[PDB]
């Protein structure tokens, strides 16, 4: 739900229910080897090396 380009725009957390709008944020991910990451998650982002 965080990393979905669309659903970040209405991110919500248990403390303050109201949606937040993360749409402009630039997430990045770092993994020592890209394969161990579960398939549904690995498949979205590109695995630059």
């Amino acid at each position: 739900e965080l990393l979905d380009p669309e659903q970040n725009a209405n991110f919500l957390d248990h403390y303050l229910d109201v949606p937040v709008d993360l749409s402009k944020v630039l997430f990045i991910c770092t993994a020592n080897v890209t394969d161990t990451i579960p398939e549904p998650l690995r498949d979205r982002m590109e695995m630059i090396n």
Binding site: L3, H14, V25, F27, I28, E46, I48
Partner: protein
């Protein structure tokens, strides 16, 4: 046109300079930086309070 989201990943031997270039992009693009390790967590509440 405007910025667009996409997720991306970097991977390679530890200590290749990954995070340093990450921050370099944060000051390249001029966006604000904030690192957030997530190695080995399972308490989803940390991501949502």
């Amino acid at each position: 046109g405007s910025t667009q989201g996409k997720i991306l990943c970097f991977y390679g031997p530890p200590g290749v300079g990954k995070t340093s270039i990450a921050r370099s992009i944060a000051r390249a693009l001029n966006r604000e930086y904030f690192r957030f390790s997530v190695g080995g967590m399972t308490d989803v509440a940390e991501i949502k309070g």
